[PDB]
Design a protein around this ligand. Structure first.
Ligand SMILES: NC(=O)c1ccc[n+]([C@@H]2C[C@H](COP(=O)(O)OP(=O)(O)OC[C@H]3O[C@@H](n4cnc5c(N)ncnc54)[C@H](O)[C@@H]3O)[C@@H](O)[C@H]2O)c1
Ligand SMILES: NC(=O)c1cccc([C@@H]2O[C@H](COP(=O)(O)OP(=O)(O)OC[C@H]3O[C@@H](n4cnc5c(N)ncnc54)[C@H](O)[C@@H]3O)[C@@H](O)[C@H]2O)c1
Length: 238
């Protein structure tokens, strides 16, 4: 293998021959320098947006990968120009990442149940790491998860406070935002490349009439997502 050690570790973690398996991911994975601006930013995101409700554990960033799905960049060219694009968390079971890296983040299939969703079958994201982290489904005896940072082309958000079974966005709208009671401090946002990064500490959003504790973001076209980073997270349960 001609791949940095942290990558090879990742490959096995996902599958369960390495070089053959990297070709199957159809993804260009690179290790982000620990002392770089990217890493300093990404770790600052992970620190500040770890939520008080999620006292079950601390997070430590083991490795940061700069993923670049083959063909995804071109697919996202339409929405690349769209305004208000954010870098957001998406957590999933480690078993899935084989598909997620090869096929990209997809919508929950037709066969799946629709009743379970707050804002319908779409691709959900969070601006709070601890929210997404919970979907890694890490446990005491398996405390290493994988978590995505997607560039999400949100555009004009349909900002809802309450469960809405959506099958069509209002005209002008390209995304839904569930308004949480607690939000990454908006005055402490920073812009990495062209993308907004809501990495401020959690403060009260000022929204009183909402059922959510934290924000969440939904998009109903797979093309609106561009996967940027892939973090290897150590869950330190209390
Ligand atoms: N993720 C789920 O589908 C789900 C379902 C049931 C309970 N819970 C628990 C409730 C609690 C929420 O924590 P956290 O995610 O940090 O808080 P949060 O308030 O930021 O998010 C609440 C979560 O529940 C979902 N949700 C809220 N209201 C509805 C609704 N009316 N219909 C369908 N889905 C809805 C919402 O989409 C989001 O994922 C945790 O203990 C969760 O594990 C989660
Ligand atoms: N997932 C979160 O980080 C998250 C963020 C904010 C809020 C929430 C809250 O959880 C609710 C559900 O969220 P969930 O993302 O699990 O969506 P759901 O549709 O039920 O689950 C499908 C799973 O399939 C994964 N996957 C994506 N691409 C592929 C692929 N090519 N091959 C295989 N698997 C793939 C995907 O990551 C997800 O785990 C949602 O309604 C909401 O209340 C989650």
């Amino acid at each position: 293998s001609k791949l940095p050690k942290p990558v090879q570790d990742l490959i096995k973690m996902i599958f369960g021959p390495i070089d053959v398996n990297y070709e199957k991911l159809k993804t260009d994975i690179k290790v982000v320098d620990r002392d770089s601006e990217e890493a300093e930013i990404i770790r600052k995101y992970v620190k500040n947006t770890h939520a008080t409700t999620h006292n079950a554990y601390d997070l430590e960033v083991i490795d940061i990968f700069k993923i670049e799905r083959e063909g995804e960049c071109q697919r996202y060219k339409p929405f690349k120009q769209l305004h208000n694009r954010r870098l957001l968390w998406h957590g999933s079971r480690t078993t899935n990442f084989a598909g997620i890296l090869s096929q990209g983040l997809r919508i929950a299939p037709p066969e799946a149940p629709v009743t379970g969703y707050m804002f319908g079958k779409g691709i959900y994201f969070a601006d709070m790491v601890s929210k997404s982290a919970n979907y890694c489904h890490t446990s005491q005896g398996d405390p290493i998860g994988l978590i995505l940072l997607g560039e999400v082309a949100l555009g004009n958000m349909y900002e809802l406070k309450h469960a809405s079974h959506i099958s069509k966005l209002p005209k002008g709208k390209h995304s839904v935002k569930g308004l949480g009671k607690t939000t990454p401090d908006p005055s402490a946002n920073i812009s990495l490349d062209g993308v907004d990064v809501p990495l401020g500490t959690g403060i009260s959003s000022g929204v009183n009439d909402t059922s959510l504790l934290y924000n969440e973001y939904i998009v109903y076209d797979i093309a609106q997502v561009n996967l940027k980073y892939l973090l290897k997270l150590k869950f330190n349960f209390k």
